[PDB]
Description:
Chain A is of the alpha/beta class.
Amino acid sequence: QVSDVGTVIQVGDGIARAHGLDNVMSGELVEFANGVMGMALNLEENNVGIVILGPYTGIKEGDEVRRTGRIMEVPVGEALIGRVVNPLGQPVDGLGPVETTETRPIESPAPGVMDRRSVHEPLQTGIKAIDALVPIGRGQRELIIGDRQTGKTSVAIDTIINQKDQNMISIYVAIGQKESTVRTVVETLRKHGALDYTIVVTASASQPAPLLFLAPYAGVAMGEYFMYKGKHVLVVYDDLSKQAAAYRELSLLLRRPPGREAYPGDIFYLHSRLLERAAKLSDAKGGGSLTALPFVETQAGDISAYIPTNVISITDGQIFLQSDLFFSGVRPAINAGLSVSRVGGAAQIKAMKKVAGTLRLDLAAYRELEAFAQFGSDLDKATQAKLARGARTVEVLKQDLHQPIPVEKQVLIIYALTRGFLDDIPVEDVRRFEKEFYLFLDQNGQHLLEHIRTTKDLPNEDDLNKAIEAFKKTFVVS
Amino acid sequence: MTRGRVIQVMGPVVDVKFENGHLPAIYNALKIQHKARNENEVDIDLTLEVALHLGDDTVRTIAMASTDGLIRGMEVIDTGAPISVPVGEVTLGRVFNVLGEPIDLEGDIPADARRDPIHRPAPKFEELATEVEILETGIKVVDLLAPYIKGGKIGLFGGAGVGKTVLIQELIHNIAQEHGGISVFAGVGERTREGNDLYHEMKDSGVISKTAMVFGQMNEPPGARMRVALTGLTMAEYFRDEQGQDVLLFIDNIFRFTQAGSEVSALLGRMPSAVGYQPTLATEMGQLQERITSTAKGSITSIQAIYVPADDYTDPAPATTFSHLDATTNLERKLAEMGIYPAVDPLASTSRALAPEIVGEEHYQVARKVQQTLQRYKELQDIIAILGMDELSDEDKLVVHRARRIQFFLSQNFHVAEQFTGQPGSYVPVKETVRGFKEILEGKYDHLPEDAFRLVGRIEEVVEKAKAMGV
Amino acid sequence: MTRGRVIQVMGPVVDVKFENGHLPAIYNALKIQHKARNENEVDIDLTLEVALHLGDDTVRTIAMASTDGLIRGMEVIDTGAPISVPVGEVTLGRVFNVLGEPIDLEGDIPADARRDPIHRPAPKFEELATEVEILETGIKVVDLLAPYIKGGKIGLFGGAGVGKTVLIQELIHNIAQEHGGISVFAGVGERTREGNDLYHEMKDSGVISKTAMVFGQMNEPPGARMRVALTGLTMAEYFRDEQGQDVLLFIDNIFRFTQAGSEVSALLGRMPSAVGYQPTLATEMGQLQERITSTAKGSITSIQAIYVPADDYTDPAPATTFSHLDATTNLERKLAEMGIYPAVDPLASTSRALAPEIVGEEHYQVARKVQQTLQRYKELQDIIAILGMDELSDEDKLVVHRARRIQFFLSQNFHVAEQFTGQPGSYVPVKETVRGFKEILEGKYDHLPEDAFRLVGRIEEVVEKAKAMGV
Ligand SMILES: Nc1ncnc2c1ncn2[C@@H]1O[C@H](COP(=O)(O)OP(=O)(O)OP(=O)(O)O)[C@@H](O)[C@H]1O
Ligand SMILES: Nc1ncnc2c1ncn2[C@@H]1O[C@H](COP(=O)(O)OP(=O)(O)OP(=O)(O)O)[C@@H](O)[C@H]1O
Ligand SMILES: Nc1ncnc2c1ncn2[C@@H]1O[C@H](COP(=O)(O)OP(=O)(O)O)[C@@H](O)[C@H]1O
Ligand SMILES: [Mg+2]
Ligand SMILES: [Mg+2]
Ligand SMILES: [Mg+2]
């Protein structure tokens, strides 16, 4: 047996310097005499800078270092569904091992510019504001950005739960969270039934920095296996900011030149290389897709910072959450004024487009007149008419926790709001009106729901108006 | 051979050179003992902890005390293991330093007593156990807008002089007197006066018979300030694991740990990160925080005070520790200055237990309505300042009227604050808080003056104070 | 011949050591072509660009692809010249990367084709031509309020989602179809989805036969993202140098070019400039833009899209871009939300071609009147909301009545907007749009409903819509 070897010079902070290892490749895995793995990142004249993928307390200066000759790979397969794993692919929930028969490189090429097809089919999140104003399609990359405790995790959990009946496979990647939060999320998914099609990849806070650095790539590598078989996959990256912090820690420990805010120069390259792997494959390549929901956590609402700007410039659209809206009762706190979605329209069914066309304009007018609303009712009649319409729009867009709504019911309630049928209901009764309207549509008018569900178009205008009037004949005001 | 030699002394950092092939492992404890050979030297009795391997048979360490008197050429002893502290039943009712040596003048621990290494890996995903139970504290703000979780992790943020120490003392007085388990207090970077006063208070109250106390204060070097918290956590972990007992863990200021780490980081050769902190800020804090958890075999509920430097909540140390907590309360200098204690920010504070199926529908609705009213009052503050109170609409004036009374009624009189004022203090049940806030929201007490609501307990005390005022 | 060896790999930055006295010049391209000698290696086909001379026969280079798999000691081939790209009639209808290699899967360029080096000095003072000619685009706002100049540089500023890419596509379509000229597209930092959509749109519409496209995608290293604009410029310069044509160079985003430059600088280890940008930002921008000039043989006119982060026009990239533009256009999400596409702000857009002796006296008077009316309308929107227009004077009522119609008639339907709405586009000559706006200003169409003016081409179509709605 033969193996090219090296000698450790320096150990500390999760970084090891090795003398020797002449023929090691950049990015190759390397194992120590202790039996722990490491990844070689700095290839210098007389030393090799090694990042350690495990506990470094057992490594001492002078120990043997050996080449492996393999680029990092992660296990993939159907068996990963319903399991909780670490970025190396090992299960952490118990329940026995995982029987996977294939492996994929953790770093692989993205689909080419000629492999893709334009995004044309919607991803139903069940959040009315998202589905009506910031549409998300299959193959899109959507950024969810906001301060701490604004509902970012809740949006992702609601989406993953809502994918129950659609033919989608969801992957949740947790970076930097304490394992109690991850276990609670797994319990919530198990309770709501989402673990039957979900893979959870976790990199806890106590784990070494390289694992947090590699976790999103492991998740996307697990996802691409299903993507290239023709399936549809949804991937959620819980904190690209924590990933970037870990990468900055590693770069500073390896003594690479620092940029702004001490970040390395390739911090944008890292995230772009990660995010560009989400794509919509053409019908020649199978027709599968992978859609991504990266997360970014800001401080004091500063969206001009380095990582927020870098991630904003990559994604197709962004969703902004604000504590101002969160505590004023407007939750979920999507700021529809600032949120954008370039893949809008194509990511919506025809009925949703028809009803949201007016909703956008109404909210735009209400946002303008909200500045003059501070002067009471001393306003021209049309102005407070538009204010009354805007208040009902805001009340309609409100939604509680873990209550996904079918798209047909969303389009029906939006149509009712936008055609003027709600102009006589008091603002304090809009939520109850919608709640009773859903039960009324369940009991009667199933034909409208079936028509929307089958033909993806609005039902006959006369029938819908008659049904709404019949319901209003039964609604009772407070 | 375990004999080394001192090479460099630079403040709290010492470099030791050993024989080739016998370097001590990282985190090992080294002993420097030396007796003066002539009149130009002083005695030394010092403990060092290994930090890095520099190559060329040299190890860079961190001192657990002052390095005055060190001379290049002293002999160093390798003990072959990390710091070990006495642990178990012998630790109840005693006060220890960072090295595990009692400082209460009650004698020395027997040399055969069990000792446990300071450094260990954190518990695992399959070992963790989760469940939400409201921890009643008797404080209106905490019980209403950010309930505490039994077996959870609670952090108390606040600037300099806002009241987090007083809140710690009130929580001890309200919970520790009947908890029924073991209590552990670890004072990091705080006042020796506070430590002495708390020790005498616990002796008076009798809680000391079931409490272990570890002290490393602001006079200590960063070496000790970085390890006192780990000593206390190691003591608590034995009661969690080997006995399956409920543990109250109090940490006086966890920020001083990262502050000491940043002080010592520059001398270790690391490049400085943003705003001068160490590159390893997140990993070092995570390796400590993830050990403080409740597992299947035992539960740990921990209350931490987290100092906020220069009232900057965006500072990396406060910003990183947010993700490690289940319930937080953010103290504010603005509220402290107006005189409404405990000066908790009613909107910045959040808790994982504020859900309809955990606290109840009525409680949830009342809390959300209070938060909405306070947010509206916060938004009206520019138009009120500029255009004046007269030009606000009918509803805005009512919102302001309810909001000021709510903000005042959130204040409370504490048992421990009777040293500053003659008012004896009170303990308010959650039912009373919810009913009182509901009554205020329904507009029942709009006819009372604003000042009647300051520093009282239940809602009936407001009526009593108003009647004293003459109503 | 003498070859180099790999000395360092530190990410996308590679150091190569050569034989003494045979160092390659700065900006020379180097080639690494390696086949695996055993199962513990991989094949490598990588190119590097010389950046610095470090001394001791060592050269610091930046890579144009991924450096994974590199081994210290591989042979490096010196190409002897800067990066060269295919050029001429063969490039029309193809898609290229930074190196000039086809990515459309249609076949390789013959190895005997002419190639030009990317880096070259800008044209000299003596050989520039300074004649001013108006370039017709067929868009109402552009042709009226901010005319474009043949041979000039035009920038489009805006945030996210305002319509810059759609507007560039519409400009390409209009100019290529109505003038028959050659156009070149440079996708600096192109998103792959957008690039695929653009390629399919050009292929479907047939414009691809007169266009060469270069793509440097976000998943490529900063050097590759940096040099794509210069590759496109090199492909465009040939048509005016050797053939004397009038060429259009469309650049996807200058902001990403500056970001790539800053990344390269930080990788090379230079001291950051004002807000973290490279110190060489101004010189890099100049060496890019200064080659886009009109000469005796031909002219190049450039339409460039600029991205403003968080609406901050003070940002260094837009700030140093402004100095090189003849006409600027500002796009507003405020206008986009109301539905007025192309969402061009009629008051923030300026052009040096809006002069009486350039566009004509009637054109200048009409444009100035439109701007004055919109500016005056800007001061009555606030007053109208609080007290209706009946409070204002009689003349201001007409001012509002006509400003609403002017605002709606500044909008137009685009050919590329078919995929969004289904209404076919229109091409509006400048002589038609000036007459239409003059008539609207003088009040010939004050009787029509204002909805008839939305998303319309020529003036007669407004009358047609009014007839359709039943005026
Ligand atoms: N639509 C909603 N209605 C009611 N409560 C909600 C809603 N969305 C979120 N919440 C609640 O708000 C709190 C914070 O939400 P969440 O933890 O998802 O936020 P976050 O931004 O992901 O937080 P973190 O910064 O801690 O990761 C939770 O108690 C959650 O139950
Ligand atoms: N609940 C309270 N009731 C009355 N006074 C209070 C209360 N909380 C704080 N104070 C006042 O504010 C002071 C703050 O004391 P405390 O030691 O709790 O502050 P701190 O936030 O821990 O500050 P430091 O960082 O300086 O230790 C008290 O000494 C007292 O004067
Ligand atoms: N003329 C138009 N008509 C309708 N929709 C448009 C028009 N121009 C742009 N849009 C919408 O704007 C979205 C994004 O525009 P885009 O070209 O990406 O601008 P930018 O590149 O500046 O973000 C597209 O999805 C498209 O639906
Ligand atoms: Mg979260
Ligand atoms: Mg204190
Ligand atoms: Mg664009």
